[model samples]
Target: LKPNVKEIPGPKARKVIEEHHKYMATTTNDPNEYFLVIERAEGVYWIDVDGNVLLDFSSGIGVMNVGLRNPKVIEAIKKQLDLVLHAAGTDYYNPYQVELAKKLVEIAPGDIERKVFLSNSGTEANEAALKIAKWSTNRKMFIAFIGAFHGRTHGTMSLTASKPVQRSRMFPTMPGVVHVPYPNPYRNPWGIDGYENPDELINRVIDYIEEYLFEHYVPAEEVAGIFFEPIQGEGGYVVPPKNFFKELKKLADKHGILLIDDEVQMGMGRTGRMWAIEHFDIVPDIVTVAKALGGGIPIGATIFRADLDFGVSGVHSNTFGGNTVAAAAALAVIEELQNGLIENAQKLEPLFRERLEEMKEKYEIIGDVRGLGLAWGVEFVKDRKTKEYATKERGEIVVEALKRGLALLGCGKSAIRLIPPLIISEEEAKMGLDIFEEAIKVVSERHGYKIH
Candidate 1:
């Protein structure tokens, strides 16, 4: 199927862009760069203002896991609206909120009895997790990894080290948060030869915490929790080795530290599992979820073992944390994911990996293609041997793909993330890959690389 590629940034989109710039705060780095204005979205495609239909591969930065405007979720929201538009869940109990919390605990990884703390977004989820960890453990210090993107709120921003720009000008961030190296086999921080073996990289990373950070700066007992993404998002969708988390869990156990898994981007069947941490077979003590949790509605949840509920009532509550409509949408999202969307993601994994591998072989600029389930990253490089980042070429490829009616987003320095809705069909997946490869072809030619 051919994409309907009319004049991009058509008149209507341009007018909207002008108005957006005039009114909206320049907070985020615009991924679209004012290229297209989406009027509406359905399934895995977006309809722009000019009637151009673009295949959505980013899934709105990994939010629409069950697909945009999922029928069940919409119906649930409508039903909830009819019942009650707003309910201050903090002050009064709402059935939807209670039901959603029960569902989260039911499906969350680990067999332990868990409790839920609902919030509005991923950052809030992380914030709640951090506060709970500190209050429960009575520790002030925490350990995070380099190239991690927890969130943008003050607490999570301190934990975030994906890019310097993210924390720029925000001095004196929440103290007592230290960053260590994340195990990235592709671009290892500890020299290329040292990380060639995955096990060696894992050992070095874990050892650094015990031998260096713990020894020099803060004692292990003083640390509240260690926060990490099971599959690092925004940091290039990098997946660690199979035993990475298992070893980390052992270390955390030895140190009496909590394992906080930030599943904001990789949860809700994005990794073909309920949680990306499940892929490692090690259960985390605390898990923060958001993004796709509410289908398209705004909702976030921090799930932890019941023992960690140390704070008194009204300690960490929000007025609109568990809004009735958002909770209803979340419940519907959970039902859809449990029914078949997760299996769909698992079934489509091979197709995505196979096509990406083929593209890697055909394109020299394609340095690496790594991911699990539906969350994939295609990294652009100047040379495979040198692995020099092709930052400019990455932007160009995204623009080229957008021109061909393929919507994508960039992550890290030189990688474009492919996080399509989990409900995407095989045909749509193939078409998106075709458009992606075509964009790579054009971009490679522009950069003086010949494609066979």
Candidate 2:
């Protein structure tokens, strides 16, 4: 369905945005001309304050996988609201928290006595992972990838290296965090065409870690864990070669280093797999989950081996870890994902992959298209050979798409991540794709590159 709107940043939206800037803290989001103030959302459609209908292609930054205000999630939250709001799981016992934790332990990737620590958001989930890594290994140093984005908290921010702006004002975060290049198949440091020579790219990364990192600096004995985003979400939807994880696991095991998978963006069946790391067939010591976990209710979970637990209490405790309503919503979200939403994603993968790859052929600006399941990224470049980032063109395409009534978001430098809810219909998908391709064509021609 096409988006019907009087205008973007509608008359009512401008007032809200004006008030938000006056009252809210100046944070990461810069809406510019392409922002929406939605009154309510149903499934994949957002009804703006001015009664405009638009498709939410970003899935609320990958949070509404089951769709906004999911019926089942809402029902579960309503039921919990009647029973309790905050039983204070951190200080006391809560049945909803216990139920959600049990479900998490059951569905988590590892079979060896997995445990769950529920938190409020991705940053907190990653913070718990950092604490668990250091406390269990008794090591202070950590090895994280160059484009990895764990979170914004002090501990996790130390591991985040996606953008300098994220850590610009705040310096000297928790020390002992080292950055290394992720085995990105596109635009890697070695300049190898990774998609064509995936094995070579994989080997380059493995060797760099084994020979260069361990052999030269970042003493293996001092390293506690290696933090990584399985698909590198915020940096871009960059999926590494299949064998990259297998080799990385071998190196981590060799050095007694824990493999901490930051699944905040790619987890909860976003990639068709229950966890994106499942695609690589490697079990990480710790898995940080958020974004889609709570079905828009705001919850995060740190699932790790039972042995890695702090053993004694008080090391890490939070007031709202597994708030009663959020836990109930999470339980509903897991059920929705497991029962049908994840299956829907699997069925839609080919539709997305084929259309995107074909677009790469049609548009000279498209430098790369990569992802698994429904999570995908399209990177724009000025030239195919030079691989120069088309950052300005990317912004224009996003704005054009917004004007057409499809919500889009930018990731990495010149890339737009196409992450719609798993519940999007085939019709909606086709419509969104048409709008996206039109936007690309308009921008490409604006720069004098036209397809025949």
Best by lDDT: 1
- Which digits, one per residue and each the tens of the lDDT, describe model 1 over residues 1-452? 34788788888888888788898888764636437689998778789888888998988899999997799999999999899967888888878899999999999898999999999999999999999999999898899999999888889999999999888899788999999998887888775433248788889899899899888877999989999999789999888888889999898999889999999999999999999999999889899999899988899999998899966775688889889999999999999999999999999999999999999989989989998999899999998888889999999999999999899998999999999899898999999999999999999988797565
Estimate, for each residue in 168-251, the C-alpha lDDT of model 2 and write its tens digit.
879889999888888888888999888899999988888888788788987888999999989998898899888888888988
Residue pairs with backbone overlap in model 1: none
TM-score for each model: 0.97, 0.98
**Where's the lowest-lDDT run of ten residues in candidate 1?**
189-198
Summed backbone clashes in each candidate are: 0, 0
